[PDB]
Design a protein around this ligand. Structure first.
Ligand SMILES: [Cl-]
Ligand SMILES: [Zn+2]
Ligand SMILES: [Zn+2]
Lengths: 379, 380
């Protein structure tokens, strides 16, 4: 009943699922979901399609089998980044073999993962599994991660563990930093530069705030360490500043946009705690003039405990040690449901690039890795 | 033979001469200058009309009677600011008497002055002056002051003294602060925020520069003093800042727009020296990254030596003590030729405002004052 691997792959690549914040480029993942939904139906899984609030008509799919607690969650995203038709030298939607490489938009990131899951399940009898098996297909990972966010917020599901099939060259990944973005906003009071003391100069107040923020930057860099990261400390970046009307007017308003990248172990609440603490002497001096607002929904840090049985099994199956990575995944939201690893075929060297491909040599190892992991946590 | 006072004033207000940095809005003062040049010719002045290099078809007028050293220079600008389409409740180019008030764009700043000079000169015999009388009418005071800058740069004229007819309510003004406006520009090096050490954050460098600038602000407030000014020290203001693309990118550029208002007697070279030395610690640590560009032609401070005959006689004519103002005039350029005073009818409260007027109560005092200064500085 299930087509062969390359045919499953071909149809997924041929179904456009580009995500974009730009209304013009943003395609519905409905056709991608229907493909996955009908195929998982055919294999005997129950299926739930979920509209995702505040997306342009995007959906999650959960495919479920078995009952009771625990089980394995296999998770991926159905969307791809846009393509540059100027730099692609093949049709992005045409799966093309050439020189041990399979070319197409989402070959590496990450439609291959679903083709491998279905391919691995082709002869498996879901009746005879001891523990539940879940397949999650999320919307809009490449933009808001609204799919994974809305799933982790609303789902009753509580698996024993989860693998998110992002391209890692089949290296298991157990952590990455978070990402919070803030606007620091300072209300001045206007006045003529003929008496620059008559008003409240927002730039002078922002100069004070920046002093305290750079002190926090130094404390973060000095007191929090995670040796496995290339940059082993939580980072703080001043990105943008704007304020004032003219050289000859008291600066009436000033705004600073910054980011912080918290290490896995530090929570969002403690980080907003550290930032309010740094700014406190300034907002106290000046009640009601300094506000801190979020620029973009925050992403928590993620880690999987390094001796978790998920990690030991995977490391042993692949004979590869776990890595940390310098990029954000859905793992922070899936980690609220159960211990989570990031592990998939193909490379971020092809992800989001023109003439994206997945090497065909990933085919046998990936089929075998998924088979072994389903037999380990469901049998 | 000259028309009456109200006719002269009517024509000057009826003749648009709005100046503007925007080429689109910048009207030629050619027709204003022509009215003036013919009226001074009719009274038997030698008149030169000079195109001002680098302006949009603008002219200076110098009207001359007599020859010899010294004499009195009476100066004013022919240009007005634009009118706001929303706010005027009558035609800015029609001189209308309402509430003992003469309404019109430039009634107060400062076309009235030219009417009062011509009116006063009706009853003067220029052949019996012992020292020359000069009237200068400048281009573009409200924008670049190119008129007065060019005149000061090029004229061989060295009058005994000069009065600029800016609106001061007929109070003698003897000094004002300068104005310099700079952009402090910092070139950083961008990169992803996942490693902030890979770049040079222009906001951090600008945080450094501002620290040094605020130290200069405090040095200026402390080490320099001129009692007559409400703010008796050179002021410094941080007016605008911008830089950088995104919260997740190292900030590659930052620009700060600031001004300084120096006291009379601080040169523009002294001030630029103080600002570059304040910024030296940042600029020496980050070679090639920090530049200082002028946003506006810089204006030196001005003062007239407070015991020149010009001040003593004008104070006595008016029964008024000299004042200082914060704002700028052409005085710093004119003062390079001769002791200069700023003295004119109409109020700085009408200048540049909708339904601009000059109160008629100023007509007699202003005519007497102009007559008297011509007698006192041209008969002796
Ligand atoms: Cl890393
Ligand atoms: Zn991905
Ligand atoms: Zn004026």
């Amino acid at each position: 009943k299930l087509p062969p691997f390359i045919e499953i792959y071909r149809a997924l690549i041929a179904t456009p699922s580009i995500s974009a914040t730009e209304e013009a480029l943003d395609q519905s993942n409905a056709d991608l979901i229907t493909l996955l939904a009908d195929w998982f139906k055919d294999l005997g899984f129950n299926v739930e399609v979920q509209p995702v609030p505040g997306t342009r008509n995007k959906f999650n799919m959960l495919a479920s089998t078995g009952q009771g607690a625990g089980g394995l969650l296999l998770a991926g995203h159905t969307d791809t980044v846009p393509f540059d038709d100027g730099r692609w030298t093949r049709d992005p939607f045409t799966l093309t073999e050439h020189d041990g490489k399979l070319y197409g938009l989402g070959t590496a990131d990450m439609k291959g993962f679903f083709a491998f899951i279905l391919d691995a399940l082709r002869d498996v009898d879901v009746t005879k599994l001891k523990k539940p098996l879940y397949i999650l297909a999320t919307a809009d990972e490449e933009t808001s991660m609204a799919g994974a966010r809305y799933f982790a917020e609303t789902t009753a599901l509580r698996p024993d563990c989860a693998i998110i099939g992002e391209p890692t060259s089949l290296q298991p990944v157990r952590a990455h930093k978070g990402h919070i973005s803030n606007a620091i906003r300072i209300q001045g009071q206007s006045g003529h530069s003929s008496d620059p003391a008559r008003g409240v100069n927002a730039i002078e107040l922002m100069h004070d705030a920046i002093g305290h923020i750079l002190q926090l930057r130094d404390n973060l860099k000095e007191r929090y360490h995670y040796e496995a990261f290339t940059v082993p400390y939580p980072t703080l970046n001043l990105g943008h500043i704007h304020g004032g009307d003219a050289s000859n007017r008291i600066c009436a308003w000033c705004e600073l946009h910054m980011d912080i990248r918290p290490l896995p172990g530090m929570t969002l609440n403690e980080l907003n705690g550290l930032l309010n603490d740094a700014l406190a002497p300034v907002s106290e001096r000046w009640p009601g003039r300094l506000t801190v607002d979020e620029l973009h929904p925050p992403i928590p840090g993620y880690e999987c405990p390094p001796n978790h049985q998920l990690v030991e099994v995977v490391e042993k199956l692949l004979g590869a040690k776990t890595e940390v990575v310098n990029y954000c995944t859905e793992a922070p939201f899936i980690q609220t449901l159960c211990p989570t690893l990031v592990l998939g075929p193909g490379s971020i060297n092809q992800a989001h690039q023109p003439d994206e491909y997945l090497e065909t040599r990933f085919i046998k190892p990936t089929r075998e890795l998924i088979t072994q992991v389903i037999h380990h946590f469901c049998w």
